[PDB]
Each structure stands twice: as C-alpha cells, then as structure tokens.
Ligand binder design. Sequence first.
Ligand SMILES: CN1c2ccc([C@H]3CN(Cc4ccccc4)C(=O)CO3)cc2CS1(=O)=O
Ligand SMILES: CN1c2ccc([C@H]3CN(Cc4ccccc4)C(=O)CO3)cc2CS1(=O)=O
Ligand SMILES: CN1c2ccc([C@H]3CN(Cc4ccccc4)C(=O)CO3)cc2CS1(=O)=O
Ligand SMILES: CN1c2ccc([C@H]3CN(Cc4ccccc4)C(=O)CO3)cc2CS1(=O)=O
Ligand SMILES: CN1c2ccc([C@H]3CN(Cc4ccccc4)C(=O)CO3)cc2CS1(=O)=O
Ligand SMILES: CN1c2ccc([C@H]3CN(Cc4ccccc4)C(=O)CO3)cc2CS1(=O)=O
Ligand SMILES: [Ca+2]
Ligand SMILES: [Ca+2]
Ligand SMILES: [Ca+2]
Ligand SMILES: [Ca+2]
Ligand SMILES: [Ca+2]
Ligand SMILES: [Ca+2]
Ligand SMILES: [Ca+2]
Ligand SMILES: [Ca+2]
Ligand SMILES: [Ca+2]
Ligand SMILES: [Ca+2]
Ligand SMILES: [Ca+2]
Ligand SMILES: [Ca+2]
Ligand SMILES: [Ca+2]
Ligand SMILES: [Ca+2]
Ligand SMILES: [Ca+2]
Ligand SMILES: [Ca+2]
Ligand SMILES: [Ca+2]
Ligand SMILES: [Ca+2]
Ligand SMILES: [Ca+2]
Ligand SMILES: [Ca+2]
Ligand SMILES: [Zn+2]
Ligand SMILES: [Zn+2]
Ligand SMILES: [Zn+2]
Ligand SMILES: [Zn+2]
Ligand SMILES: [Zn+2]
Ligand SMILES: [Zn+2]
Ligand SMILES: [Zn+2]
Ligand SMILES: [Zn+2]
Ligand SMILES: [Zn+2]
Ligand SMILES: [Zn+2]
Ligand SMILES: [Zn+2]
Ligand SMILES: [Zn+2]
Lengths: 159, 159, 159, 159, 159, 159
Amino acid sequence: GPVWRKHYITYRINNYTPDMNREDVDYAIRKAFQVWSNVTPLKFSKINTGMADILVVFARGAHGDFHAFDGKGGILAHAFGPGSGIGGDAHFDEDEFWTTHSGGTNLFLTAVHEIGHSLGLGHSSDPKAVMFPTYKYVDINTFRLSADDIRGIQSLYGD
Amino acid sequence: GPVWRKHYITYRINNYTPDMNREDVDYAIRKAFQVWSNVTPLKFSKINTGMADILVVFARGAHGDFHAFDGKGGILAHAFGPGSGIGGDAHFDEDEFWTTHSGGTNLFLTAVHEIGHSLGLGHSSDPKAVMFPTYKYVDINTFRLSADDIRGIQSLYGD
Amino acid sequence: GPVWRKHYITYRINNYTPDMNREDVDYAIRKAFQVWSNVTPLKFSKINTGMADILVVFARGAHGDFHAFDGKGGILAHAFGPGSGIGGDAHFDEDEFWTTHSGGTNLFLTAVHEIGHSLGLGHSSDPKAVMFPTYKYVDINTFRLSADDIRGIQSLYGD
Amino acid sequence: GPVWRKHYITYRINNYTPDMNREDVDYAIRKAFQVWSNVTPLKFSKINTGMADILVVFARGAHGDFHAFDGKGGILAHAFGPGSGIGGDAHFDEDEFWTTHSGGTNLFLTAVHEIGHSLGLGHSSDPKAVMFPTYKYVDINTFRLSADDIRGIQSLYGD
Amino acid sequence: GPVWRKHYITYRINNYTPDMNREDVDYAIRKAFQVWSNVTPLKFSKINTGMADILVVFARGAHGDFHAFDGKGGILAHAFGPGSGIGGDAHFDEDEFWTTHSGGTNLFLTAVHEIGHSLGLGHSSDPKAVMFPTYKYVDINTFRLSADDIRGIQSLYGD
Amino acid sequence: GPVWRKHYITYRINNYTPDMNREDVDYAIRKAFQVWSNVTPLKFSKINTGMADILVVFARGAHGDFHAFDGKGGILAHAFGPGSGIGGDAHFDEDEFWTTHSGGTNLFLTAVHEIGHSLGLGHSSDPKAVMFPTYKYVDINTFRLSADDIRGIQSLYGD
Ligand SMILES: CN1c2ccc([C@H]3CN(Cc4ccccc4)C(=O)CO3)cc2CS1(=O)=O
Ligand SMILES: CN1c2ccc([C@H]3CN(Cc4ccccc4)C(=O)CO3)cc2CS1(=O)=O
Ligand SMILES: CN1c2ccc([C@H]3CN(Cc4ccccc4)C(=O)CO3)cc2CS1(=O)=O
Ligand SMILES: CN1c2ccc([C@H]3CN(Cc4ccccc4)C(=O)CO3)cc2CS1(=O)=O
Ligand SMILES: CN1c2ccc([C@H]3CN(Cc4ccccc4)C(=O)CO3)cc2CS1(=O)=O
Ligand SMILES: CN1c2ccc([C@H]3CN(Cc4ccccc4)C(=O)CO3)cc2CS1(=O)=O
Ligand SMILES: [Ca+2]
Ligand SMILES: [Ca+2]
Ligand SMILES: [Ca+2]
Ligand SMILES: [Ca+2]
Ligand SMILES: [Ca+2]
Ligand SMILES: [Ca+2]
Ligand SMILES: [Ca+2]
Ligand SMILES: [Ca+2]
Ligand SMILES: [Ca+2]
Ligand SMILES: [Ca+2]
Ligand SMILES: [Ca+2]
Ligand SMILES: [Ca+2]
Ligand SMILES: [Ca+2]
Ligand SMILES: [Ca+2]
Ligand SMILES: [Ca+2]
Ligand SMILES: [Ca+2]
Ligand SMILES: [Ca+2]
Ligand SMILES: [Ca+2]
Ligand SMILES: [Ca+2]
Ligand SMILES: [Ca+2]
Ligand SMILES: [Zn+2]
Ligand SMILES: [Zn+2]
Ligand SMILES: [Zn+2]
Ligand SMILES: [Zn+2]
Ligand SMILES: [Zn+2]
Ligand SMILES: [Zn+2]
Ligand SMILES: [Zn+2]
Ligand SMILES: [Zn+2]
Ligand SMILES: [Zn+2]
Ligand SMILES: [Zn+2]
Ligand SMILES: [Zn+2]
Ligand SMILES: [Zn+2]
C-alpha cells in the first residue's frame, strides 16, 4: 500500500556488523539496491551525514522498535514500508552470522528481500520470488528477481 | 495522551480500495473528518502532494508496520495516535468489503472511529460511543457522536 | 483440522457471569449447542461433576491461558479447537455485558460462534456465516446457520 | 475463573535449576505451597512418579508452550490457571539467577506468586498483595499474604 | 525442560495434507520419528484409534490454539514440548506445499525438526543442527543429525 | 544500534500524570536526563513549543502505538530508540502510581531506565545496571549508574 513519492531515495548505514568487513557490507547493500533500481526509475544514493530515507541497522534481540529479533536463525531481518521517520528502515538481526558467501546468512540476498519491503512490496506466494518469505541461498551471480517481483515493483514505480 | 498541537490538520489518501469508486472513498473520508471538526476548532484539508499529517491507507495482512490485519472480518482497521511520521495515519483492512451502505463494512462509520484515534482518543466503555470497540451499522443520516465522544474530543481541543 | 472422535460430548459451566441469571446462562448455552447438534449426529450433555469435554468460563483480562481479553467490546470470547485438557474450552470476556437480548452482547449468538470453534470450525469469509468473525445481533427466533456453516460442520461430523 | 475441584493437589518438580542445590529448590517450593494451604482447606503433596496436577519447570527462552521467556530480569516466571494437562503448571525463567536470599531473584517469593496463579488467582491492584505484578524482595521470615490475597484465595476454596 | 517419562511413545495423524498422497505422509512422518529413535531408547508407534501422545495436524492460519500460522513460507510448523493434552502435538502449516522432494517444503525434514520439539528439544545455535531454526533442504539419503542434536536428545533420554 | 547524531537533544513533556504535582514531574525527568549527561557530552533541554526529540507521555492501556500497557504493576513504561518521529519517545504507564518517593513506582528511577533506551541502550544482564530489566527502589541520593551503564553509554557518545 505505502509507496515512496520520489525517484531519488537515499540510504545510510547506521552501524556495521562485525561479521564482515565494512566494505563488504557497503558493497552487499549497494548491490541489493541496484537489483531494484535495475527494473525501475528509482535511484539510490548512500549518504554519511544527514537524514537518509532508508536507515540500515544491525541489531540483536530488543533493539528499540518493540519488535525484537529471535536469536540465531529464524527471522533474519525486517523492514518498514515507505514513509518518514522509521518508514523504509531495514533492520538486520545481528545474531545471524552475515556473510558474502553461502555460509551463515548471505547479507546481499537478505538485503534484496528487505529493501523490497522498504520500497513497498509485501510477501509473495510465488516460490521463485525474492519476496517469498522463505530464505534459500543462491549464488549472487545467478540470482535474479522473478517475474512476480518485477510486476509488483513496477506496478508501484513503473519503467 | 498524544495530541496534535495545531488546528489545521491535513490528510492524504495514499491509495484507494477497489471495493468502491474513488469519489465514494473521498466523500466517506471527508464526512468522517467533518464529524469531528463539527465539535471542535479543528479544520481538515485533503492534499494530493506533499506530506500530510494523516495518511489514509488501504491494505491487507502484513502491510509495512509490523501489525498485520487479520483477513475478512474481525479487526477492520487501526490508526496511530497524534504524532509525526506514522503518527495519525489510518490503515483500513483491504480484506474487508468496504461500502457506502449497510452491506460489507461501512467505510464512513469505520473512518469516524479510526480518525478518533488519529486525533488522540482511545476506546470508550460507553456502548453508545463511536469509540466503543464494537462495530454496529447505523445509517449515516442518523449517526451521531455520543456525549462521551464529545467530552473526550473537546477535553483535547476544546470549542 | 482438529476434530472430536466421538458423538457424545459433554460441557460444564465453570462459573457464571453476574450479568445474567444463572438459568439464563444455562439456557443460552444449551440453545447454542442445539444449533450444532441439529445439523449433525453430535449430542451434547451438561454435567456438574467430573471432567467435561468443553468447559465454559467467564473471565476478564488475563485469566490463566496467556491470551488475555481486551476489556469491554472488541474481542468477545475465544475457544480452543477439539482436544483433551484445554481443547474445546470456551472463554467469554466478562468485561462484556452479556444479555438474552439486543443490548450489550448476546450470549447465545456469541456462544454459537465459539462452540463452532470448540467443534473444530475456523472463521469463514462468508458474510452470512455464524463463523464470520464480525458480530452482528439478530433475534434468536430468526437466527440460522448459513449453508457455509452447515457444509463445514457436516464435513467434519456428517449427517 | 478456572478453579480446582478438589482439596488434594499434587505437584512434581520436572527439573532443577543449577543456581541452587536440589534441596533448596524443594524447600522453597514446599514453603510457597504452604503459604496458600495455611489459609485454605487445600493440601499439597510432592510426587516423584505419575502425573502431578502442578508441574514445576525451570526453562529459558522458548521452552515448548509458545510463550517464551525474555532473558535475565523482567518476566521471572508464568503459570497456567487450574486445569488438566498444562493447567496449573508453573514455569520459572532459567535466565534468572534463583536464590534462597536477597540476591538474584528469590525462588520462594516468586513461587508464591506463581502458585497463586496455579490456584486460580489473577493479578491484584493492591500494592501489598503477593499477586501484585511487581516483584519486591522481602525476607521470608516477615513475608505475609495481604488481606486481598486471603480474600481472593478463600473466595475460591473457603476455610 | 519438559521431558517424556516413558520410552513407548505413540503418535496419530489427525488429518492429511492434500499436497501428498496419504502413504507419502505416513512414510515421511515415520522416517522422521526413526531419526530420533535411532539415537535413543525411545520407540514410536502409529495408532489410528485412541489417544496418542503426539498428534500430527495439518492446518493453515488460525487453527484452534491461538498461535496462527502465517501463510505460504516463513513459519512452516510448530510443536508443543512433552506433556499431556496438547503436549507433544505437531502442527504443520497447510499453506506450505508439502513434498517428498526438493520442491515446496520437504515434510520429512520439517517433521524431524518438529518432533525434536515434541521430544523436548529447543532451538540450537549450531548451523549444522536439525534443531537450528533455519530451513535448508538436504536430500533425505544424506541427511543426518548433528553431534549437537545427538548430545541434546541423549542428555534427555540416554542410550 | 540506533544512535543520535547530535549532542543537543531536546525533550518535551506531552502531558502530566495526576499522581504528582507538575513541578515534581518536571524535576524528576530533568534529574533523570542529568544522570546521562553527567557521563557524556550530551546536553538536554526542555522545550514547551515546537518538535522535541524526546516526547514524554503518560498513558494507560492502548495509547496510540499498538503496544498497550498492562495496568498497575508489571511493565512500568517503554521507550523507542534514537530516531525521528516516534524515535526516542518515552511512555509511562499511567496505571502505575508515580511518586517522588519509595511508594508506588518512583518516576525518577524509571525515567533513568527509559531515557537509557531513548539514547540507544538496550537491557543489561548486570544486576547492578540501571538498564537491568528488573525494577528495584533505591533512594535518589544514593542511586548511581553501574560501570556497565557508563561503558555502554560512552561507547555511543564518548566523553
Ligand atoms: C533470496 N531470497 C530471500 C532472502 C531473504 C528472505 C527472508 C527470509 N526471512 C525468514 C522469515 C520470513 C518470514 C517469517 C519467518 C521467517 C527473513 O526474516 C528475511 O529474509 C526470503 C527470500 C526468498 S529467496 O528468493 O530465497
Ligand atoms: C460506528 N461505530 C464504530 C465503527 C468502527 C468501530 C471499530 C470496530 N473494529 C473491530 C475491533 C476493535 C477492537 C478489537 C477487535 C475488533 C475495528 O477494528 C475498527 O472499527 C467501532 C464502532 C463503534 S460504533 O459506534 O458502532
Ligand atoms: C451471530 N454471529 C456471530 C457471533 C459472534 C461472533 C464473534 C465476534 N467476535 C469479535 C472478533 C472476532 C475476531 C477478531 C476480532 C474481533 C468475537 O470475539 C467472538 O464472537 C461473530 C459472529 C458472526 S454473526 O453471524 O453475526
Ligand atoms: C513477593 N511478591 C512477588 C513475587 C513475584 C511477582 C511476579 C513478578 N514478575 C514480573 C512481571 C509480572 C508481570 C508483568 C511483567 C513483569 C513475574 O514475572 C513473576 O513474579 C510479584 C510479586 C509481588 S510481591 O508481593 O513483591
Ligand atoms: C532439516 N532442517 C530443518 C527443518 C526445519 C526447520 C524449521 C524451520 N522453520 C522456519 C522458522 C523457524 C523459526 C522462526 C521463523 C521461521 C519452521 O517453522 C519449522 O522448521 C529447521 C531446520 C534446520 S535444517 O537442518 O535445515
Ligand atoms: C532504577 N532501576 C530501574 C528502573 C526501571 C526499570 C524498568 C523495569 N520495568 C519492568 C519490566 C521490564 C521488562 C520486562 C518486564 C517488566 C519497566 O517496565 C521499566 O523500567 C529497571 C531498573 C533497574 S534498577 O537499577 O533497579
Ligand atoms: Ca534470527
Ligand atoms: Ca526512514
Ligand atoms: Ca552477527
Ligand atoms: Ca509495533
Ligand atoms: Ca479484518
Ligand atoms: Ca502521519
Ligand atoms: Ca476490499
Ligand atoms: Ca498461547
Ligand atoms: Ca472484549
Ligand atoms: Ca476441554
Ligand atoms: Ca460482564
Ligand atoms: Ca526474565
Ligand atoms: Ca498441570
Ligand atoms: Ca538460572
Ligand atoms: Ca507458513
Ligand atoms: Ca499430545
Ligand atoms: Ca498445502
Ligand atoms: Ca503496568
Ligand atoms: Ca521523538
Ligand atoms: Ca497513575
Ligand atoms: Zn527492528
Ligand atoms: Zn519479508
Ligand atoms: Zn497498519
Ligand atoms: Zn479502535
Ligand atoms: Zn481464555
Ligand atoms: Zn472466532
Ligand atoms: Zn512456559
Ligand atoms: Zn503474575
Ligand atoms: Zn498450532
Ligand atoms: Zn523450531
Ligand atoms: Zn507507548
Ligand atoms: Zn527497559
């Protein structure tokens, strides 16, 4: 339902998980956004000062929004739909072991799903959709949005 | 507790339910606001561009705020008390069948209740209050706030 | 899913609401069960000693099962599906004002819905079904299960 | 609402917290039950084989009933009201540091409160009641039920 | 914490998912139990009449225990720890597409995890444990409990 | 995780509890903030007009954010971590009896804990920490942050 009313959207990485190197996090997040900007007129920019539209946060258990994570495994992250303040923010469960590979939980893949929410997409019932609520590792090189993801995101922002 | 610190309050209809015609939704919502402005110094205006104080959204199940609706029937909608960002926003469960009549769930009647929350009112224990938590259809022509609703809303904004 | 594996089912009224006379409660509950036994091979009997299959309880707020009621209005009651121990038990929110008429919340009508759950039925999306999650008063003399209710209950116990 | 329909009630200690010696746990629990049997016709017996009415369990986080504890501090324990199966069972959050003294969280004091629930008592609004929802250490030698606790428990079992 | 006090444990399949053939369900469930009996003195038997210790149920959304499933994906099932009545029961989200292969959600693999709970095991933080809260398909022929699973289950029942 | 990106932070008292005199509330809150500014470079100012970073609200039960309080005792208050809109806001359960002394629930002590959250601190497992989730009255004259509180708050804002 909720949707951003602009094409230029900014994000800021609030804090970094110690599981990966800082540049690994920056890259994974940037690639995740690119997946969506590739099929829409949306443009994403990372900022280090000022208020960003989408704040990326790594935290475990109770972290300030009354929706605590559950420890290692299970729920991997969550994000608010489009909006001011908390809207669009993406939170990643620090109790997970984030990685750039097939071990632990892949940050890039999870970020794609979460940003889908940040942009206004809900869960899909299509097994192939990145918005399907069940995580399944796939190499980044072969990862691709499903037609369902494309349709949904374009129904909101076009292109 | 929370209360708006101004008399001019704006609202924007984020998206429309397919259950009714667009103008039916605009009218029902406008009439709902008028019910409250009629007994206070508050003034409501609908805007189509810019940030509105109260955003009206139609959505089903999980819709971005971590408080998912429950399908047809039961919870019909929910709204945040006065505040910035999400504050004041009213969400209507799309799984309900919204109408301008006695069938399905009447949008106008439900909107009056929700806006009551948007303005800072909680649930009432008075069976006659629009803020009573149990829905009961009443023709719009004979609908009226109860003394309890009036007292509560005026204790906040006067007039 | 859950279903009783017998036709003779007993119920016991744990405690009585002070809103009505004891015999009014006994009658309303008995009539509610009869609505279901009328369209199935099920037989219900009220017992005053021993362990009943379905325990009827009146309570407010937190009452021992970790699913507290919400005060006057809103959720009126809840019940567990078929099973031993807590299974089948029906709890009625004492914060409601129970009646034998159109005022407050009608016990008989609510009990029919709850017993539907006690017998293994979930919510229906049919507006006419007693299992539809939205309460609407109807005189007992004209009340009747919808075809959807009948089909569902008979798919479980036949007749 | 729920209430036991007998005077002879048995309890069994499912497992022991490593925080205290086994006999310290047995004693604290026995003293907690005695607090209630002292003002009612109820009689409690500890059994080591067979099905007990009240099962005492020490566990952390998610422990099998879908109502997970919250780690050290905060919620200290919880218990189901009178009934078969899970009814009456008392669960103590293992993440707390249980003791026989003023340090950590006193098992005896907490057990008195929990057993109050096991017997059918809800929370009290009386600051002096053991059933008041806020924990406050008091030496066992000077601990005593409040008039509110007495009235409530006797309204259920007399004496 | 909770644990069964016997070696002979029975289970009964309450209802069957239409996703698979009846015999496919019976087999998958039987194999899941065998995984646990292989490393303990426990013995499992399927019964078709009478009260089973562990009831297997397939259901979607709200199904009678006040802990509704969430639709396709996400939470796949849940189960109560050892105990009478509801204790030990395993519920499988019918909104998932259950299979005997790598498509949809594998019943056998999920059942192994759930039965782990039914037997008294909680979630593990070991990525290799079947009790780790994140689902990952693995061919049944190569599936195996992790040392962590073995230790945990044997700490409860030995062998 | 979330953290304020400035040293000058403002707060505004939305409404006052009738339990204490207005000046008692202002003082208790001011002292609570001072506890934190004493060990960091942070500076807090109370404003009466305009948008404050941290809004202090007194409310009971359901109060507009979908996380209702629980009546007298138990949960005493809650607050959102650093952020715009609702971020940082502190809500105090009006069902508690707030005081400047050892009776009821001490506002100052509770406010120190809540502001800890407002500033970005989560719960501590150190029994001596003000951020430990279990309330324990201590005279204001002898109250002091624990080393754990200091370390945590300084890891975020330094000094
Ligand atoms: C790359 N893809 C991802 C990545 C992440 C997620 C979700 C999974 N998840 C688990 C979950 C979701 C919903 C309910 C319970 C558990 C998360 O928390 C957040 O990320 C789902 C999917 C589908 S996929 O195409 O395989
Ligand atoms: C016109 N009036 C309305 C309209 C809407 C509502 C509420 C009912 N509701 C159901 C509910 C509320 C609380 C808890 C459970 C279910 C909603 O969700 C939102 O609207 C209540 C009432 C009382 S009334 O005077 O008859
Ligand atoms: C006679 N009929 C009843 C009686 C009772 C109920 C439900 C309503 N309800 C409110 C509710 C349900 C679900 C979610 C929020 C609120 C209850 O709690 C229990 O009873 C629903 C219906 C449909 S009806 O044909 O009009
Ligand atoms: C000896 N007494 C106890 C012991 C235990 C408890 C409760 C407190 N508690 C915290 C709680 C309760 C409710 C909500 C949040 C937190 C528990 O979990 C279980 O025990 C309350 C009280 C009141 S007292 O007279 O001081
Ligand atoms: C074969 N294995 C299974 C099978 C099932 C499950 C869980 C997963 N799950 C998702 C979940 C769990 C907890 C929280 C959110 C989502 C379930 O619901 C039930 O089954 C976990 C695991 C770990 S594994 O070794 O790969
Ligand atoms: C002065 N100190 C306070 C003040 C307030 C609080 C918390 C307690 N609490 C109860 C609670 C917390 C978490 C879960 C259940 C119950 C609150 O709600 C808010 O304030 C904790 C503590 C630890 S202390 O050093 O003794
Ligand atoms: Ca997790
Ligand atoms: Ca944002
Ligand atoms: Ca981590
Ligand atoms: Ca929330
Ligand atoms: Ca609904
Ligand atoms: Ca708003
Ligand atoms: Ca609709
Ligand atoms: Ca529950
Ligand atoms: Ca109610
Ligand atoms: Ca029962
Ligand atoms: Ca009543
Ligand atoms: Ca705890
Ligand atoms: Ca029991
Ligand atoms: Ca412990
Ligand atoms: Ca699911
Ligand atoms: Ca069972
Ligand atoms: Ca299915
Ligand atoms: Ca409280
Ligand atoms: Ca704020
Ligand atoms: Ca008060
Ligand atoms: Zn979060
Ligand atoms: Zn998601
Ligand atoms: Zn919403
Ligand atoms: Zn409402
Ligand atoms: Zn109940
Ligand atoms: Zn229902
Ligand atoms: Zn428990
Ligand atoms: Zn309690
Ligand atoms: Zn279930
Ligand atoms: Zn699990
Ligand atoms: Zn709040
Ligand atoms: Zn806290």
